[PDB]
Amino acid sequence: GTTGERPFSDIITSVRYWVIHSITIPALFIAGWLFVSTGLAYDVFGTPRPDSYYAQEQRSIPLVTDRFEAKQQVETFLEQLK
Amino acid sequence: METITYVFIFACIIALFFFAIFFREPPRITKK
Amino acid sequence: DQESSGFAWWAGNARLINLSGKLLGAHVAHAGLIVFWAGAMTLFELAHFIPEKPMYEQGLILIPHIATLGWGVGPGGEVVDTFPFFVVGVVHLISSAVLGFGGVYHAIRGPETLEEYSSFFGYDWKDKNKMTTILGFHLIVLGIGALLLVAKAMFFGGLYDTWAPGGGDVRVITNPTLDPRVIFGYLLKSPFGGEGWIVSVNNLEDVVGGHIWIGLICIAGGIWHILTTPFGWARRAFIWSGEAYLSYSLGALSMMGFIATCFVWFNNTVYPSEFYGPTGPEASQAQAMTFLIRDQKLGANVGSAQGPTGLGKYLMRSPTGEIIFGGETMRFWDFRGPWLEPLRGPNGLDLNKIKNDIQPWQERRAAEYMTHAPLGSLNSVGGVATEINSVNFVSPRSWLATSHFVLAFFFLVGHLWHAGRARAAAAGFEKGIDRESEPVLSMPSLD
Amino acid sequence: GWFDILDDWLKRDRFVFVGWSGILLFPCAYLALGGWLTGTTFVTSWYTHGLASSYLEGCNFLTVAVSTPANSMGHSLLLLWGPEAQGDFTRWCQLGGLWTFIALHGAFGLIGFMLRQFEIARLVGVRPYNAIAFSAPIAVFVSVFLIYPLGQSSWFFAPSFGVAAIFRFLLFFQGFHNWTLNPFHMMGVAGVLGGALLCAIHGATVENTLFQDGEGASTFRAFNPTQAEETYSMVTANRFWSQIFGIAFSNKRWLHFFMLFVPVTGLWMSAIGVVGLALNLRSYDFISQEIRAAEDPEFETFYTKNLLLNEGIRAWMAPQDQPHENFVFPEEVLPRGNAL
Amino acid sequence: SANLWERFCNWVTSTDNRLYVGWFGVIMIPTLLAATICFVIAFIAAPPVDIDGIREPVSGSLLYGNNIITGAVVPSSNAIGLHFYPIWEAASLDEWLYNGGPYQLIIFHFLLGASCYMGRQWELSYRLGMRPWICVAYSAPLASAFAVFLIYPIGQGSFSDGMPLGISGTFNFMIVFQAEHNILMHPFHQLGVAGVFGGALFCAMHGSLVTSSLIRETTETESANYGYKFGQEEETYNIVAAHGYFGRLIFQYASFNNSRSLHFFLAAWPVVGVWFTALGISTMAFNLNGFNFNHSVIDAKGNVINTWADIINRANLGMEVMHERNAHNFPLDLA
Amino acid sequence: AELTPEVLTVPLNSEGKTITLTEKQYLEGKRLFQYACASCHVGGITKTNPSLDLRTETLALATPPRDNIEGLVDYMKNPTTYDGEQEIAEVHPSLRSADIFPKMRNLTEKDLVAIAGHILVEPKILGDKWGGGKVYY
Amino acid sequence: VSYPIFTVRWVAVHTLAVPTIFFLGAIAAMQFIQR
Ligand code: CLA
Ligand code: CLA
Ligand code: CLA
Ligand code: CLA
Ligand code: CLA
Ligand code: CLA
Ligand SMILES: CC1=C(/C=C/C(C)=C/C=C/C(C)=C/C=C/C=C(C)/C=C/C=C(C)/C=C/C2=C(C)CCCC2(C)C)C(C)(C)CCC1
Ligand SMILES: CC1=C(/C=C/C(C)=C/C=C/C(C)=C/C=C/C=C(C)/C=C/C=C(C)/C=C/C2=C(C)CCCC2(C)C)C(C)(C)CCC1
Ligand code: OEX
Ligand SMILES: [Cl-]
Ligand SMILES: [Fe+2]
């Protein structure tokens, strides 16, 4: 009923754990926060910002129409201030 | 022809139900 | 005192079945939670309440309960004074602390049992005399309460009557229906379409009158149970245990939970469409009204208008001949309402009144109730599932009905569960089949 | 030999068993779940479906999804380093590259997982009836997320990974394939619904035919983890159902195999039906019905009613559901009943 | 005779009957026999029914051009609504069959009997000295029948909107429901499939695990089932070997070792899930529908950015717009 | 793709003169439009009379012209039929009938201008959607 | 016993825990984005 690993109960209870994780856990949180709040996430995944779905006048959708020249076609969609 | 076929199968299932319930193998204990 | 050697943690409250003292604390602490909610919620509702705006458009379910009793409202359900709402809220909220006090006390300080610290309050589940006596006590307490309503209605102000002659207004009832033939007649009424059983009450005279009968009957049975014991059959039929009694009351609440669901959904009188929303049928009726009113002004003869099916675009006949509204609204031809009745004749909707007795207040009433049907989403978006986000609204009649059905249902399950255990507990096998004496093994084989 | 030493290490009894299978399972399984959780929050479906599909855009747990690639892509594997994305990651994301990522990875993850079942069973020395059972979920994923779109024009018509994105996949199959009218599908629900019955009825039967092995009411503690006697009266259970239902089990070994057969067989039947939907070989109509309905304008069944619902679904959804077709349906051509 | 009535009560309650006709049985058996006989006759030979009360008869019987898949027993007319429509309420049977008379006779008898069937599932358990609550598990499928045949019609104000008694008729009930209530986007329904999927899942789980961990007592060319005799003392499978395997599949503590804790979960999960799905239909019977995320996410200018929720709405519109063609005269469907 | 003041420029009166609203006014109007209009005029339609919508073109061919701030504002005080040959304040929300339509009591002239502006700005943004019904949803 | 620290379990746990909170932090920030 037991294996080598240190029983979670002990670790989650050990003061040393929290001394570590009171630093680590919030760190990742603030990091993830900054990832969004700095607008970096938008560029990493090409996700459009609220003002970047259409052009000002245009009401059409930037649908990719061919596979091989898709990447080129996509870049052209960003050109029209989209 | 179709109606007949549908009722027939249905009637056959109901017939089965009867035999399944009242003409099953008697469930014998221990010494089986 | 009580731990794993009695019940499991997730069945903890069952360790209190034979601890009258602590078992009293629970019921008193619990009763505080109910008063607490009623109080704290009323103040919450009032804090958001907007006077010059319909109550059903604000998610109110307690303030409209107060409005019905003739408090802070006037002509057409117009909100006059918000003080009675504030009062009812704060008074309750206060009483919750008092009850909560005793609750906490009896559960962690006071005697863990009552039988010794007071033989009057202490009790035995199998003591058929004490049980029917305690039952007799509550049967009176509830009885006086029923008269508390009668008093408010006849003396202390009245109730909100939507059927008011001059139009919906707070009216003092000074003629309660006491005729038993009429009163108890409701119980002999069908529960289907048309004959609506208890929910079919359509005037405050019966409401007040009925409560007079209940109040007396309740106290009467209250005294009866004080001064008696269960008979012969009464003892050889029921199961006498702490759980059994619970079960009996569980199914009772379930049944009342279902009745309440239909009441708030169908009834117009004790649930005013002015404070709550328009009832389901009422709203569909209103649409037929609205477009009958419109098209008629465009020069259409509603009486002879032929719809797609050739049935009657605006007006048609009921299965028994009455003139009713057309369309899918043919299912709601059993609807009665203050705004609609003046158009009704001895044979149903009168074509002459329809033709030139339509009043402006009726037209906008129909328009109002039409655009406020009890249709909405979980996230509170009024309209059909295909509607667009804009109108944040879900009729209070919808909230109450759904909520109280779920509760009613689960209580019917709670019933089955606790009644099934009680029967097994009594006879003594609620903990498993006796390995040695296995009953089935003593019965002949059917094979 | 290093092999047997590598083996030794892998097959070591840890908290989370690795094993040979683990070399395939854990990498894929993690990337699959990771890829979903990634796209779910960050990646959009604007350039592929004209849809918002991430938390970053404002979608919630229900409306989020990792949408399929465009119809232009075809059945392209959409490799990160493929002709489409051309090594670019951002482009890859915008072209719905994460879908084929999740799909293909997850697919192998399902292979590894069953292998794990096989591998662990062998070690523990138990029969592999857990692996046989797991074949049904495989067939479904394979048939629906792979075989089906492979029969259509592109990956675009495969079910997109997401809550709402799956609901439209349901409504689509109704409108276009009349999927509910398919016999293979009916067998499907019959297996799942009937399987969810066996699960329920057997559990309740056992808990309420138990022997008394303790003095407490909470009979959970009163169980012997080390076999010995039967914890519940199989004999009493038999006589019970034999009198309320007329038929009853009397052979635990069959009863449990039956609990394996029913749900596994159902899912397999539902798979075959979908395999037929790939070639659009659906069970849409009844020829005898249509012929009478044409000649006779007064003949109406619940079957005819449904088809009218399908026509409505197709007409009103197709425009925004199939952008690549550039559909334009004038108001007057839209099929509508009266008033509505 | 010790006493006729006393003997009567002893025969009814008798546990020596091939089929336990209980006290609930005294109500169940007649009601169920009336329901089934009327059904079978209807499904085969009943004439078309004006379900929507718009004088547009819908034939759903075999003899009238239907087959098993299409055939159904059509709900009562919408002109009747929630009114009680027994045979003795019609001028003739011809009128009774036209207005969907049989439907009420069936559903009322069924729901009544099916309730007593639950009541009987307690009684026999009582007479046999076994624990109750088996009927409590049956309360979930029953509450669904109630929700679909009684609660939804009550809420919607007509029995014509209750689920038809047939295959294709059931499909119609769903498609239309989805249009008007958006059931797929409702938590209770989602909990329903969760119990149903999980059920089938767990049913396969347990089923496989147990049958895979059977103790050897059979030949190589002999049915492994014969390795069990009806009325055994000891167990027929190694539950400790089962836990050993499944405990390694995921991880030990995420595996059952208590057969009683196992079978409780096996029973709890589907029953609770179906309970919610039953409450879902009962809640949406008062038009408290699923989440409405139509036109939620919009861009910086105000343009509507569609989601899958919007794509669902289009499909829903088509259903709404096309269902019950000639039944509507007014813009809003509020009935 | 944003709500520029170029978009928030709507005709003030019949004589061509225009007015430019602010993002504060828009939101305020949009909120007020939900408060006292959405009930019947959700998405630019009219539930109690689908024949007349809130399309700018429809408001233009109205009598008097209601396709400008001044027009709509007047309407919200003294509403008429499409030909203007009949006052309908009794069965339609308005200032001179706030006793009948409580929602209109709070509403002040600032609110009226905001609501009026909202009706003119929405079609500029939504387009065909604003006018049509379920078809364009 | 003298338990170790870094183990295979430790690795696994972190492969899920570390990204999770990083995402939970990211999503939490999204609740303030507008237009
Ligand atoms: C008047 C109402 C009433 C009363 C007084 C009791 C009293 C009792 N019940 Mg009970 N019961 C009721 C109604 C009632 N029941 C109903 C309606 C049902 C049907 C669901 C049940 C089902 C039920 C079962 C299945 C069992 C009991 C048991 C018991 C006994 C032990 C109490 C217990 O387990 O607490 C423990 C309490 C809890 C563990 C709390 C449960 C929390 C619930 C399930 C969640 C509620 C959801 C909530 C609204 C959402 C909140 C959101 C959250 C994030 C905060 C006790 C005598 C037990 C027993 O020993 O039988 C005799 C037992 O096994 N009851
Ligand atoms: C309506 C809710 C409710 C109520 C009134 C009670 C009441 C009670 N439970 Mg209980 N219980 C509940 C829900 C409830 N339970 C639920 C949902 C569960 C499942 C988790 C349990 C599980 C459970 C177990 C397992 C046991 C009890 C027991 C008891 C009894 C003794 C309490 C105790 O040990 O004090 C201990 C008190 C404390 C440790 C301090 C708690 C602080 C107090 C009580 C709350 C203060 C309230 C408020 C903030 C103060 C206001 C003060 C103001 C008026 C001035 C008591 C009658 C026990 C029993 O059978 O009695 C012998 C027992 O063993 N319960
Ligand atoms: C049971 C009766 C009841 C009814 C009919 C209502 C009705 C209402 N409440 Mg309300 N409320 C209640 C009890 C009730 N409340 C209680 C007990 C509390 C105290 C917590 C509150 C606190 C409260 C607040 C603070 C507010 C309301 C508001 C509202 C209104 C808006 C409804 C809404 O948006 O909710 C939607 C709610 C949901 C969709 C949540 C549904 C939760 C379900 C029941 C969970 C079921 C899951 C199940 C239990 C899981 C268990 C299974 C497990 C054991 C396996 C509406 C009139 C709002 C209002 O007035 O604004 C206009 C508001 O702000 N209520
Ligand atoms: C369900 C309600 C209820 C019940 C049955 C009991 C029962 C009991 N309490 Mg008690 N208690 C309660 C609520 C309740 N309490 C509340 C809410 C509080 C908080 C204030 C207390 C605080 C409390 C304390 C501090 C003590 C008790 C004690 C006792 C026990 C001795 C009897 C006693 O003191 O009465 C004596 C009083 C009377 C017989 C007459 C009181 C009548 C009052 C003043 C009027 C009540 C009016 C009522 C609301 C309306 C009814 C009239 C209507 C029919 C027209 C007894 C078991 C004592 C104890 O533990 O001893 C064993 C003790 O020391 N209680
Ligand atoms: C909720 C309050 C309440 C409760 C719990 C009880 C509880 C009890 N009363 Mg009772 N009683 C009450 C109020 C209450 N009483 C009132 C207010 C009065 C005054 C009218 C009486 C007058 C009274 C008398 C005269 C007698 C009792 C008796 C009894 C005991 C046996 C009851 C029995 O076997 O019924 C079981 C009932 C039946 C077997 C008959 C079933 C047929 C029912 C009535 C019709 C079908 C119900 C249907 C589903 C509901 C539809 C509504 C209907 C109108 C259509 C029991 C302890 C008896 C006793 O033991 O005396 C001490 C007794 O002789 N009661
Ligand atoms: C063992 C685990 C495993 C497996 C089976 C896969 C499988 C796959 N991954 Mg993958 N991946 C893994 C772990 C794994 N991954 C890990 C841990 C990561 C994180 C770094 C990734 C990150 C990742 C990304 C980012 C992508 C994939 C993709 C893919 C798919 C296409 C890859 C391809 O073309 O394979 C190629 C197969 C091989 C290279 C195997 C060759 C083995 C031979 C024996 C070696 C011979 C070499 C020698 C030089 C040849 C000489 C011949 C001479 C003529 C030149 C495929 C389903 C792609 C995808 O899903 O597209 C949609 C994609 O874009 N993977
Ligand atoms: C036993 C027990 C329990 C229970 C408990 C209870 C249930 C309690 C209760 C409690 C209570 C029941 C309490 C109450 C309280 C209350 C209060 C305390 C109140 C207050 C009030 C006030 C203060 C008022 C005032 C005001 C006003 C008038 C207005 C404005 C604002 C204010 C609010 C301020 C538990 C489960 C936990 C555990 C176990 C045991
Ligand atoms: C794609 C990709 C990749 C991958 C990545 C990864 C792998 C990631 C991961 C990620 C992750 C891994 C994430 C996670 C997340 C999570 C989350 C976000 C969660 C949340 C949660 C929650 C929210 C909860 C809730 C709940 C429940 C569910 C139940 C009940 C209660 C509660 C409420 C608590 C790579 C780089 C390789 C390559 C390239 C591409
Ligand atoms: O029936 Mn079937 O569908 Ca419930 O909704 Mn209204 O009425 Mn009719 O319309 Mn839709
Ligand atoms: Cl239809
Ligand atoms: Fe089992």
In 3D space, the residue among G32, D205, G22 whose CA is nearest the CA of residue E134 turns out to be D205
Q: Whose CA is nearest to atom 17 of ligand 7?
A: C97
Domain ranges of chain F: 2-137
The alpha helices in chain E, defined as continuous H runs, are 4-12, 25-45, 93-98, 101-127, 134-137, 139-146, 152-156, 167-181, 187-212, 239-249, 259-283, 308-322
CB E315, CB C384: distance < 8 Å: no
Q: Do D62 and E291 touch (CB under 8 A)?
A: yes
Q: C134 to each of C137, C141, C233, F57, how far by Cα in Å?
A: 5, 11, 21, 75
Please, which residues have CB within 8 angstroms of residue C322's CB and are 6 or more apart in sequence? C333, C347, C348
CA–CA separation, D154 and D73 (whole Å): 7
Residue A75 belongs to a domain? yes
Would you give the DSSP letter of residue E132? -
Q: Do E62 and B28 touch (CB under 8 A)?
A: no
Rg of chain C, C-alpha, whole Å: 27
Nearest-10 Cα torsion for C58, C60, C63, C66? 130
CB E294, CB C388: distance < 8 Å: yes
Q: Do E136 and C370 touch (CB under 8 A)?
A: no
Domains of chain A: total:
1
Q: Does E112 touch chain D (CB under 8 A)?
A: no
Strand order in the sheet with C323-325: C315-317, C323-325, C348-349, C344-345
Q: What six digits make up the tokens of C95?
A: 């009483």
CB D26 near ligand 8, within 6 Å: no
CA–CA separation, C112 and C90 (whole Å): 32
For β-strands C315-317 and C323-325, DSSP reports them as: antiparallel
Residue A22 belongs to a domain? yes
CB E184, CB D170: distance < 8 Å: yes
Rg of chain D, C-alpha, whole Å: 26
Number of C-beta neighbours around residue D58 at 10 A: 21
Scan for tokens 């943690």, then name that residue.
Answer: C9
Number of C-beta neighbours around residue D80 at 10 A: 17
**How many Cα atoms are found within 13 Å in the side-chain-facing hemisphere of C194?**
12
Q: D20 to each of C127, C395, D113, F15, how far by Cα in Å?
A: 69, 60, 11, 83
Cα end-to-end distance, chain A, whole Å: 60
CB C94 near ligand 7, within 6 Å: yes
The closest ligand to the CA of C330 turns out to be 9
In 3D space, the residue among F40, E314, E188 whose CA is nearest the CA of residue C378 turns out to be E188
Total count of residues recorded for chain A: 82
* Reduced 3-state DSSP string for chain D: CHHHHHHHHHCCCCCCCCHHHHHHHHHHHHHHHHHHHHHHHCCCEHHHHCECCCHHHCCCCCCCEECCCCCCCCCCCCCCCCCCCCCCHHHHHHCCHHHHHHHHHHHHHHHHHHHHHHHHHHHHCCCCHHHHHCHHHHHHHHHHHHHHHHHCCCHHHCCCEECHHHHHHHHHHHHHHCHHHCHHHHHHHHHHHHHHHHHHHHHHHHHCCEECCCCCCCCCCCCCCCCCECCECHHHHHHHHHHHCCCCCCCHHHHHHHHHHHHHHHHHHHHHHHHHHHCCCCCCCCHHHHHHHHHCCCCCCHHHHHHHHHHHHHHHHHHHHCHHHCCCCCHHHCCCCCCC
- The domain of E229 spans 187-316
Helix (H, G, I), strand (E, B) or coil at C232: coil
Residue type, E182: N
Rg of chain B, C-alpha, whole Å: 15
Phi-psi category of residue D105: left, alpha or beta, with phi > 0 → left and psi -120 to 50 → alpha: alpha
Residue E190 φ then ψ, to 5°: -60, -40
Scan for tokens 């009113």, then name that residue.
Answer: C293
The closest ligand to the CA of C116 turns out to be 4
In 3D space, the residue among E170, C219, C295, E320 whose CA is nearest the CA of residue E328 turns out to be E320
Q: Do E299 and A1 touch (CB under 8 A)?
A: no
Residue A14 φ then ψ, to 5°: -60, 135
- Say how far residue E260 (Cα) sits from the centre of its chain: 27
Q: Tell me the nearest-neighbour CA distance from E234 into chain B, angstroms.
A: 12
Scan for tokens 């020596």, then name that residue.
Answer: E16
CB C58, CB C48: distance < 8 Å: yes
Please, which residues have CB within 8 angstroms of residue E6's CB and are 6 or more apart in sequence? none
Q: Tell me the nearest-neighbour CA distance from B14 into chain C, angstroms.
A: 20
In 3D space, the residue among C372, C186, C377 whose CA is nearest the CA of residue C269 turns out to be C186
Q: Does A73 touch chain F (CB under 8 A)?
A: no
**Minimum-distance CB partner of D301 among E60, E249, E320:** E60
CB C38, CB C62: distance < 8 Å: yes
Nearest 5 degrees, angle CA D194-CA D206-CA E260?
Answer: 115
In 3D space, the residue among E60, E34, E66, E35 whose CA is nearest the CA of residue E47 turns out to be E60
> For a substitution probing ligand 4, which of C24, C96, C105, C106 has the most ligand atoms within 8 Å of its CB?
C106
Angle between helices C396-427 and E259-283 (to 10 degrees): 150
- Chain F neighbours (≥3 Cβ pairs under 8 A) are A, C, D, E
Scan for tokens 């609220």, then name that residue.
Answer: A50
Residue E72: which H helix or E strand, with range? strand E72-73
Cα end-to-end distance, chain F, whole Å: 21
Domain containing residue A64: CATH number: 1.20.5.860
Chain G residues bordering chain E (beta-carbon distance below 8 Å):
35
Residue F10: which H helix or E strand, with range? strand F9-11
For C288-419, strand residue ranges (E) read 315-317, 323-325, 344-345, 348-349, 376-377
- What CATH number labels F2-137? 1.10.760.10
CB C100 near ligand 2, within 6 Å: yes
Residue A79 belongs to a domain? yes
- The domain of A13 spans 6-82
CA–CA separation, C410 and C39 (whole Å): 26
For β-strands F9-11 and F18-20, DSSP reports them as: antiparallel
Please, which residues have CB within 8 angstroms of residue C42's CB and are 6 or more apart in sequence? C62, C63, C66, C85, C88, C89, C92, C93
Helix (H, G, I), strand (E, B) or coil at F105: helix
Q: What six digits make up the tokens of B11?
A: 């009637």
Q: What six digits make up the tokens of C266?
A: 């169908």
CA–CA separation, D221 and D207 (whole Å): 13
Residue A60 belongs to a domain? yes
CA–CA separation, C281 and E23 (whole Å): 40
Domains and CATH numbers, chain C: 1-277+374-447 (no CATH), 278-373 (1.10.10.670)
Technique used by the depositors = X-ray
- Chain B neighbours (≥3 Cβ pairs under 8 A) are C, D, E
Report which ligand 5 atom has the smallest distance to the Cα of C187.
Answer: 54
In 3D space, the residue among D197, D164, D208, D170 whose CA is nearest the CA of residue D263 turns out to be D197
CA–CA separation, E7 and A25 (whole Å): 75
Scan for tokens 């749900």, then name that residue.
Answer: D263
